Amino acid sequence: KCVNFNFNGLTGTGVLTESNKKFLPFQQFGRDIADTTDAVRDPQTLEI
Amino acid sequence: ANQFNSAIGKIQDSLSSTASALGKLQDVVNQNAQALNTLVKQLSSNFG
């Protein structure tokens, strides 16, 4: 669903889709070539 | 008959080995891709 997505670091809007992208254990979020965050790790559980 | 057929066969070897012959059409995509990518990068700037 398309709603506001805020995980602990920023407020944003998008749609969550499970993908194969992986983050470092201490890593929170990452950005695309456009300098915009395409994914954020769950602050509670472990998922990308 | 041998001259016309041999000239067409050289086209397949020219486009496969030399990729710079099509660079005229590659610049059209590059000028459009660099213009869109740079236009996005200005959103992160504070502009004073």
Curated annotation (Swiss-Prot), chain A:
Domain of life per record:
Viruses
Result after altering residue 34 to D: In strain: Alpha/B.1.1.7
Q: What does this protein do?
A: Attaches the virion to the cell membrane by interacting with host receptor, initiating the infection. The major receptor is host ACE2. When S2/S2' has been cleaved, binding to the receptor triggers direct fusion at the cell membrane. When S2/S2' has not been cleaved, binding to the receptor results in internalization of the virus by endocytosis using host TFRC and GRM2 and leading to fusion of the virion membrane with the host endosomal membrane. Alternatively, may use NRP1/NRP2 and integrin as entry receptors.
How it assembles, according to the record, is:
Binds to host ACE2. RBD also interacts with the N-linked glycan on 'Asn-90' of ACE2. Cleavage of S generates a polybasic C-terminal sequence on S1 that binds to host Neuropilin-1 (NRP1) and Neuropilin-2 (NRP2) receptors. Interacts with host integrin alpha-5/beta-1 (ITGA5:ITGB1) and with ACE2 in complex with integrin alpha-5/beta-1 (ITGA5:ITGB1). May interact via cytoplasmic c-terminus with M protein. May interact (via N-terminus) with host bilirubin and biliverdin, thereby preventing antibody binding to the SARS-CoV-2 spike NTD via an allosteric mechanism.
Q: What protein does this entry describe?
A: Spike protein S1
Species of the source: Severe acute respiratory syndrome coronavirus 2
Which gene name does the record give?
A: S
